[PDB]
Design a protein around this nucleic acid. Structure first.
Length: 49
DNA sequence: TGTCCCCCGCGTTTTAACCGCCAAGGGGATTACTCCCTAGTCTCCAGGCACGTGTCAGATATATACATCCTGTTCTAGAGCGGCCGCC
């Protein structure tokens, strides 16, 4: 369920940051989703927690 | 005994070693279900062991023959000496 289709990207990355701070996201998957979601442009949110 | 060049003691400046802190995510450790194969017999039989023996490669033997090592003699190169020549 890390895909972004059928949902606004901003609310989705907000929820992703919530579970990212929550410590149950397996970080590499989170930066991979950011890479294939915003075409590598969201590199500043890797250390949001 | 000498030497000289190879290694030690020390000054200086980097450098990565140890420590403080942080997550991670493969991975060690534990628990459980289950499934194969190894524990344990019965019977037997075909390979393995004790016995017996003809035999074929190794050892003894000795003149012959290697075979290299030690030594003697000769060849040739090197240093010393002496005679001859030119110069002051």
């Amino acid at each position: 369920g890390l895909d972004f289709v059928g949902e606004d990207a901003y609310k989705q990355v907000l929820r992703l940051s919530r579970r990212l701070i929550n410590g149950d996201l397996e970080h590499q998957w989170f930066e991979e989703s950011l890479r294939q979601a915003y075409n590598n442009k969201a590199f500043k949110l890797y250390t949001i927690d």
